[model samples]
Target: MTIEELKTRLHTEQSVCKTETGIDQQKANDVIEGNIDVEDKKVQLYCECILKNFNILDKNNVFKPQGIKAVMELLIDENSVKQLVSDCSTISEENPHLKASKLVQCVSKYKTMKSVDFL
Candidate 1:
């Protein structure tokens, strides 16, 4: 699914579970209450991770309010932007700095490599 779709699903599920505003608390309760099994716990954890990553990105103004189209030329395509952000969110869960720093580093590297001669 697209990043927007995945994000929407997460939010909808959270709201349905009465956990939208209390993500960490609700997740803990889900585990404690046995509402979600071990395997499902991992899924929940990953969802939380993605939310955290998205919060960081939003705080950093990494993307425009509506999407990422305001900055990266490579992400001019809506589907490409969605896919890239979604993939990054998933991968961020496993990487140190949750892949945030790595993403910024890669962007810097790409700019340098291209020798655009402009900031």
Candidate 2:
């Protein structure tokens, strides 16, 4: 998918997750922009909800590298996406919420960091 198409899809999912999780708009925006405080329970759950919506983090708290790579491909180069998947695919955080939040932070640090307004 093109970047614009991806952004549109992400925004739609984000909206659904936001309402489901009842996350504040500012906090959700902060998390997406990498200004997240993972320790915050709401923040953590918000991240999890967002990741689940994207299929990057499953209900079982597993990180799906394919899902990560799939989203990254829409916003970054293949080489960068591959490296991101390689570096972030094996997250071992025990806390499901934290694991989800960390994955979002890791992926955001790449090319989409500055342009992640969609989520």
lDDT computed for candidate 1 = 0.39
Question: Which residues of candidate 2, in runs, are more than 4 Å off?
Answer: 113-119
Clashing pairs in 2: none
Q: Compose the digit string of candidate 1's lDDT tens values, residues 14-57.
A: 45434433446555444323243323434344333433443434
Error of 1 at 36 (Å): 38
lDDT of all predictions: 0.39, 0.77
Q: Write candidate 2's Cα lDDT for 1-119 as tens digits.
A: 77777777777877787888888988887876778776887778877887887788777988888887877776778889888888787778988888877777777778443385543
lDDT of 2 at 36: 70
